[PDB]
Swiss-Prot record:
Disulfide bonds: C23-C86
Role according to the record: Immunoglobulin-like cell surface receptor involved in the negative regulation of receptor tyrosine kinase-coupled signaling processes.
Native species: Homo sapiens
This protein's name: Signal-regulatory protein beta-1 isoform 3
Shown segment, full-protein numbering: 32 to 144 of 398
Domain Ig-like V-type, residue spans: 1-102
Designated gene of the protein: SIRPB1
Compartments where found: Membrane
Amino acid sequence: ELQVIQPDKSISVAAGESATLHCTVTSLIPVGPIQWFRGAGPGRELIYNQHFPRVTTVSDLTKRNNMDFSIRISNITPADAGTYYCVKFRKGSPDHVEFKSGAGTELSVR
């Protein structure tokens, strides 16, 4: 069964530096997008969906068999502090449905 693995429980970044948030999936099935959020609450913030100026993917997503969905966030400030979740969605009608979430990585800003 598909796992969403966020190895880092927490990371510590100096304001102005970049944060690398790691996430890998263990399957391409079921088919559907990976999204990053800050928070797991009902008003969680969208951080990345396959636009946001300061985010890039660590790996090349336009590549068959890719299972790395780690992201890099540039120019970190205290406004970025929080817990970041990598979330797999299954494709559906009308829209994609949340399938499974990674464990969360806490970003502290020094």
